[model samples]
Target chain A: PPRYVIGYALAPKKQQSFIQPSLVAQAASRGMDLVPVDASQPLAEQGPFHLLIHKLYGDDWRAQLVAFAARHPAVPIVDPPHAIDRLHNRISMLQVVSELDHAAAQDSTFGIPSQVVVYDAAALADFGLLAALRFPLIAKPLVADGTAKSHKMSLVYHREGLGKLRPPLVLQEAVNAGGVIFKVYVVGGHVTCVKRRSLVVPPAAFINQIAGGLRRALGLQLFNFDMIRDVRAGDRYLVIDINYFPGYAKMPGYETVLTDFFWEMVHK
Target chain B: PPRYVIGYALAPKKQQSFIQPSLVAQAASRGMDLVPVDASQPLAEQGPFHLLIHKLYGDDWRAQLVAFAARHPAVPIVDPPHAIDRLHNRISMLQVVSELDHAAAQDSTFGIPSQVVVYDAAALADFGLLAALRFPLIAKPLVADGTAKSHKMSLVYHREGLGKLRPPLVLQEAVNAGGVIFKVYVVGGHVTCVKRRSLVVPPAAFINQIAGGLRRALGLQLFNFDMIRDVRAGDRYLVIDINYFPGYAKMPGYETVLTDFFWEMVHK
Candidate 1:
């Protein structure tokens, strides 16, 4: 029989240009082959990949990927369409943050900065303002993706400032973190916490609880998130941003950790 | 017993100060009493009003009104809360236009300017820019509240412009109408067509079929919408905007038409 098999569906250039030297090295050692895939040909014609690991590109392609998964229920996909769909809307994503806050109130081991998504101005009129948020809140786009604007968030001092924002935006109250951010990386299901000097910021709740809960939440296997140990003296721990399959160039053992995980998945 | 009775919820002075004096005169002459109501007192106790007519305002009083509706479902409230909620977001409202275009392609009697809701930029990478939408699109805020900024629409010419917009905004393709707009007013369930400085607009596709269809589409009794008749010959018509309860200051007989509709609801 052929060595353990895995197929990946990241953007073509991303597959070729990405230098995952260690992942390939480990795959060869374990007699597993890591192959790049596209939507170009019939997925069935492409070998019966043990599993398909993909980063979805657009709405139309989603149909193709979903159809591919449906055609062969036997081969597992890293993320079923349902899991990926959950992350698209901001209002839906913040419910997790609210849940963590509730858990903290009851003394759950984890918690997060209190946040709210504001879709309309009148909804947050003068009276609704400050019931739970502070001025100088962080306004973020509802959807998360690789666009540069998605990474950038706004700081609004006036409550009505959110009123001036575009719809489906989330207004997050700023926490006085000493600006010490942690990029919690999860690859092949391993967790690596990396600090930030304005590094990538993903969205989320507490680090491990969120990172751990999310795989089940999203049915996802690979991803990363951002959190804060807010140096606001008393306010230290909270989760902030979560990212989809992030860059590991700066992480110390990214090569080995990722490579190790890739093979581990194949063997499983 | 009074010949007819009605109540109204208006911004306290709005009804008294407006130039529509003939409406009150007509109501009084017809032996119908029009009293102003507010949330300060329970709606049930505020006299046995045959119906309570209202113009929707900001968020502060929404809960009070919703609670009132819950408590006294017997009271004939002019507009249902569910209908108002549906029109508050542009993405949700304009899908009908998108569907109509689809119907026209399959040989329906009518069509509108094709439209779509784009909440982010990453959605428009190279090919997505023209799958169905053309460039130089009109970007509009979803809600039709009287906010100065809300009325203002943007013309996004470049590919990246939609991405630059706030979420839940609409992208409507431009058409060269003679800039004539028709205001279709529905007050107390009676339709009044007014040709404005720019008037031109429909029957819902097929109200009780348009009335009942629009009851869910706009879900309001006191709203007006805009449409354009393309100046270029051969391109007969296309709807451009849908407004919720727009002001009736300019229409000549708005007074009697509106006042007459209120009593019609009570009798029905």
Candidate 2:
């Protein structure tokens, strides 16, 4: 057993890109082993690792890692599991904005889209609903992460068009934001902002409020969100989606960031 | 205007059935006339009516009637419009059950079928979803009243069956309640529990609690709901559908209930 082992679980395919050997070597250079974690295996047989760094998505590994994290309180788990949990579901993820909206609800007439979490067809027929919402709605799955299909979305043109969609989804008024997406990547206390090709909206609006809310609400140390600006006018933006620890390959010096982040966890 | 008049809006088709001449005569004999109300016509033009007894289903009438009620608080609208609003979406209605479930959290093995409101297909791909819900889920339009399609329902045997469903819908676990439905109708403080043939289940459970909640949550004076018992067992039953100001034509003495209910509103 190494003096210090850091447990991790990345799909074998992603291992080459996310958990590169060079970064693994950096941990070794510091006299620690970046180890593989098999959730189904007996906890003890997995070697007594001092720290577990997981970019975990979906519910399966979550229960396993969280239970392990709970059982072994002495062992530090990067960015507590609950933080990841809060961002997994798109509804609860966006509800964070509402939670913060009332607090920071000052002169900003901006917020999450007037959306409804749907479970059945009658919700579409809700009388005041059609009158309440603007047309051209975006329908997306409520679970944004953990599944391959979470990102699939549909643009509903009219009330009659609603029949083309399904339940267990969120229908958000498609705000006309110039097709651009801002991906904010956070590694521990360090945050790096990256702009990505997206179905655009507006300039970055509530970076501080969101980061503040995420920090307050989930104690989140790492993650990213898709944000856009409203199309009509003014300096307004809205958060459309947020995800758990994302692929940081796009962020420059992600290796150093992760290394430094882990270094502090180990030495501090 | 004779001391008071009760104005109601029902389609011409329903006017013949629900607005029977004898029922109208009861209010007329009581020094009040149950007049037909056209929502498109302003409340004043409709007559300086004291109360609006609308079998109001959709949002079109909702805004008009609710605004009218708000303008005239003393008018005492029957089955207050908001009651219909709450029942318009299955998620919020059932959420009431969940909201109450936490209070008396003991001795409850069954709950709202481990359900979640959906707007898109992504929610189905949620990792733990399939495991949490039993197969053969019931996908119903989120709104249970009004509209030709509000009562339309579909049974999803698997997660794959979900896509065939449309958004603004509700997904309920198909409780093995041997296929019997109970239709409970209420007018003011009077409750007439009449058993309509249905997909039956267990002991009548939270019919009172649900109706009470509907009353308290929306300040509803009259309404109705569809209930079923769980086939698996226990003192647990679930509310499947809720409708506002449902025609109580089948409930014996319904005219007496309405006349008494309206009489108290105007004179008392």
Candidate 3:
């Protein structure tokens, strides 16, 4: 019996340099077949393949992947295109978090409406929208990943700051989780015991910047979540970011954990 | 046999009131079971039913839906949460469209490198990031209803108006379609039919407004595609918009078509 080969489809320009090489090398070492589905070529020219892993990070790519997947249902694809479709959006992630009954941070609230009240930009000169959530709120774009578009999760201090912000902004009641943050790694339906520290950053800075660095280092499987441990609230956890296909190299014990998890998922 | 009920999960608010009553009434009239899921309620509270219909917008809601579906795999859901997740993001949608060899409006290009180039937004001040694409671009948000935040698809001849725009704008290379635009309704990968019409506004504008009205009226599981039949390009159709779960009430002679289709999908 021939070992099944998995084809990883990725954008030619952005992900070509590092990810392609890393994934190919990793798959080869494991005695599994891995191939790159280059987006540069026409889909028709791509020839026959067992599974297509759409690594591109945009809606158009996802749509195309769906159409392609429809044509090839026999092959099993990881993180099914539809799964990526649902999880890629931040607003969607929040919806899922709202469903979980776990305790949240002190200032955090979930399940906010789509329409965010945007205040006057001038009045928000000092604290901006981040400081306006009556409770300290986390501010991030409704969209996720590379498309976050300057959206950041920040801690807001007061109503006055919120009153000054613009319209179409997301303001959630903030949760104060002491200083420590937790990253829960989930694959399929199972949760891993291994964890990563999500550094606590002030609302003024970009959380993705810090998290992105960590993700690129440890290229693990499908999704990684980041949450803060609120000491003020007796070690309560508040989720801040969830990275699908997060890089694992940044985590302390990622090498062993990632390798073990990948082998287990692929082989057994 | 137990009769299964299915209705859209909606938020309890003033705006949603207008749409919810109609849906409930329709279900009642058809003698079909209608199960209404509250947006505020957690997924764990939901009962087993034929299908779950959700109307809440935004990525947050989408993510929650995905988690819910994952938790409950037995129930078949409309607009599968995962599919919604992938299509909600403009960038992701574009990626999908690009892969499908579909013609899409040009907008800000995005990928893993985390960079946005302002293109079509330069020509039309209202165009935002889409101005970067060369003249005759179709305009619309990645995700929007017909009534809100609607803008006319404009041909930007002036360059000065473009600088003050925002990111994530819409643009597509203009096609010479004469006066006729095509509407293709797709359900479960089946193309119902192509409707052609002449419009006073640009092709994209007319389709965006009318597609929703048609879907609402028909009340069917469908996607309304807006395309232009380019006379110069030898009847080549250029798709400008992809409307998911559109109301088909306005489409003439669609009543029987929709009813039969729904009955077939749900019953047989």
Candidate 4:
């Protein structure tokens, strides 16, 4: 009997388009069962399945998935919600990454401060604290699908620009990405693919481009990471952002990669 | 003006109780402009002066709170969802705690294994694989609120028991507590109270008994914590759990403590 793997994307049905065909194709070739359930729906209705791939962004989604998974014991999930919550969220991820013995070597430009103040306009003004970050600092919303809030990842040139920014903004010292980015795709604890990019323009644009690449490169694998080469530190790769799935159909050679991923999940 | 504190439990409105009064009361007594809003209402209806204290027992409440906070930026929250997500839901807190130069003395245990078969249950059924770890290992759910899950804090005598268990379960060598458990309460970056327990049992009962004592000793504060001391470790204390605004009202000096906490928030 051929192996069957079920894929559940915990996203709205309309947003499913963001999932790349490469991942679906990979699963089909591998003789794995593929299932994509809209995460917006309640978990009780999502299934009876063997494995779940929760594909959603934001702290709320993350928390919802964790609770859903806890109630359903029949199916195991990839990149368990708790793990994802730990390693994916901006502040949490940075905190964990900093503790890694090799954090200094992997990326040290964005060391998380001991205290993180999350406030909006009034609080920021009340605190009398400016962005004070150097030009080109990384400012992104802490929620998933934040790209819709602001078209481009913010590139702040001055402290005043930060004051005008909204709450829930993640501010960090931006690392210069020496015009190159590396997306290291890890599937089932193995580095499956490594893609290098030379980009120009803002850091968010660079990260989005890499996001699309990683989705295509890794195919149907549950979770993969995208990294960029630090401009200040030659040859060192720093992680600017991560994605649950970039919808690889948008990328080239996605068909093959997606098919392979699906097969791996089902077969072995 | 005298400082007066108040306490409003967010849920089970019928169970609402107030304790020792402090800063807020003081400010009010001094004729400062202050008014407390009930957080039970929808965020859209909350007043600007009110602070939301969303008491989260699980991920569902946590998610709701996050969404609520995101939607209502004007009202301040006692424990911001982002901060709670960073500390309780993810392993990131472990990493963050490890960074404290003082954390080196503490041997940390993580919930998940570095490498494991993805979703293959049969592959994980082998107990001999983990025989290297001696008996009397501590096991708990990877996420916070281990007490609520009925998860054994210390598993002594069963490796096979773990094999039959599910994923996302963390197992570690049990640290011997000499004869007492220490609960250290920290509030606003300061240690507020430390409760020592002479008798150790699964799920803490002493915490309930010492609630009044703790409040009397610590006074009114926000974001308090309790530390457990292991007697076998020569009175060494290991942080097993952390709680936000523990139910001190149920303790001996409930009124005084509750009032004090309210006073602090309002006046300070």
Best by TM-score: 2
State which candidate has the highest lDDT: 2
Alpha-carbon deviation at B69 in model 4, angstroms: 25
Clash number for each model:
22, 40, 76, 67
Give the per-residue lDDT digits (tens) of candidate 2, residues B163-251: 66655455655646456667778666566676655423333344555566656645578777676666655455556665666778878
Whole-structure CA lDDT of model 4 = 0.44
| Cα misplacement distance, residue B232 of candidate 2 (Å) | 29
Model 4 Cα lDDT, one tens digit per residue, A88-135: 444433433323322222222232221222323433453312333235
Q: Which tens-of-lDDT digit does each residue in A91-170 have in candidate 2?
A: 55654554454335444444554345554443445323344555566777655555565465667766777765655466
- The superposed Cα distance between candidate 3 and the true structure at residue A109, in angstroms, equals 32
Sort candidate 1 into its docking category.
incorrect
- iRMS of every model, one decimal? 18.1, 16.4, 13.9, 18.0
Two-way lDDT contest, 3 vs 4, winner? 3
| TM-score-superior candidate, 2 or 3 | 2
Q: lDDT per residue, candidate 3, B122-146, as tens digits?
A: 2134212232334434444433433
Question: Which segments of candidate 2 are over 4 A away from where they belong?
Answer: A1-3, A13-16, A55-63, A101-110, A121-133, A148-154, A157-162, A176-179, A197-209, B1-268
Per-residue error for B212 in candidate 2, Å, reads: 23
DockQ values, each candidate: 0.02, 0.02, 0.03, 0.03
